[PDB]
Design a binder for this molecule. Sequence first.
Ligand SMILES: Nc1nc2c(ncn2[C@@H]2O[C@H](COP(=O)(O)OP(=O)(O)O)[C@@H](O)[C@H]2O)c(=O)[nH]1
Ligand SMILES: [K+]
Ligand SMILES: [Mg+2]
Length: 452
Amino acid sequence: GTGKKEKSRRIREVKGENFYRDSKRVKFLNMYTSGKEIRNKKGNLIRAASFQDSTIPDARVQPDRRWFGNTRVISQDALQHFRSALGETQKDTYQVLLRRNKLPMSLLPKARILDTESYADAFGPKAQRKRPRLAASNLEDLVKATNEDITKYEEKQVLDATLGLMGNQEDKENGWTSAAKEAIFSKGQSKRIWNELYKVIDSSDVVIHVLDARDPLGTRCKSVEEYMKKETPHKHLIYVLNKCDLVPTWVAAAWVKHLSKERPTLAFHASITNSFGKGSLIQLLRQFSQLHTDRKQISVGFIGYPNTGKSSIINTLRKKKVCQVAPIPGETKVWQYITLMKRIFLIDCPGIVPPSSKDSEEDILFRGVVRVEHVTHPEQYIPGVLKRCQVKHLERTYEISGWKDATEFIEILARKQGRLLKGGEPDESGVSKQILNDFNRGKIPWFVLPPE
Ligand SMILES: Nc1nc2c(ncn2[C@@H]2O[C@H](COP(=O)(O)OP(=O)(O)O)[C@@H](O)[C@H]2O)c(=O)[nH]1
Ligand SMILES: [K+]
Ligand SMILES: [Mg+2]
């Protein structure tokens, strides 16, 4: 074994250097076990920990006439040309600027009443305002304006009375109070989850926003996209339409065409055995990899609503079960790094549900956000299923027919499936929960029509 000696190897070709590591590699790998201070038997500190010295530098600034000069200047023509060219370039989401760090990206009347007339002048013990500021031209125009305003106001009260006066006004009239919103519908909005989301975004060079094919606009998070455009514009955002196997092919094609106007969009079907769109996604990520040639590698973040298949997409890319997947929301709790290649990293993130007042509890329940078992009255959301699914699809799925409304549908399904309580009365809550779970998990086919 003379030829395997380190002296012989050095003839053929720091501390710890061998065949598998050179000095640079050894010095880099020693970082993970560094940062510890040195103590002796006497207690004296031979050396302090790295970045932990207690010495006091003499903080000084030397005088120089160059501190006061102009640091950056540009001509008018060059500034105008730069504005035009790069401002036109930015708006395209299919365009990417190379070496964006070294670019000069930072280069990119009603009168006030108060100044002439103060609050004291307008009203109070010391007021001096005695006549209207802008008096009417004459009496007839004033009466015409009053008549027009009264007509408009009466119309407005009639319009908003059909929602408020018949609603909230009568609600408190009888003393009735609507039941408080269930805490289940507020899930996905804890500060832990949003800290995870912001960490993932801050660490991601490219962010993949995952949308469900059946309901892409419903699962799309406008607030996060607006925040990324305003605050981290150098990151790239793309659309991946997951679960395209549930909808018809033409629906997916139309949705991809509609969404590609905003930003690059790929239709995807996440599966370990037989998938769709894996090669296209790999090609796009590779393209982004060559575009960021300066960086050691690029990191890719997956964000979206819960149960959109982010972990499933990562598993499809790895062709392995490297990420936990489950239909129940809240499966992924923290971010997770996956090494797709040496140049590309993937980050798994918990699903986020941006808070919106206009999103009713029924819509959130129908987007797969919440756990169905925790809903109080699952039957009350059953009619919604009836207005999102074709009758023939339900007849094929459950092998039943002849219902007039949701109550009869639930009763017939429960009797057919034998979901009977003690005494023979059907289990309405359990069957309703099963129907909601089946709607969410894709057993019942449904989709939203794409815009014309
Ligand atoms: N039919 C279908 N189901 C999917 C697809 N992707 C994910 N799922 C299902 O959605 C459930 C939850 O998805 P998951 O990967 O955990 O989404 P995540 O929470 O965002 O990571 C799983 O039980 C999957 O079986 C898909 O492309 N097609
Ligand atoms: K999940
Ligand atoms: Mg997941």
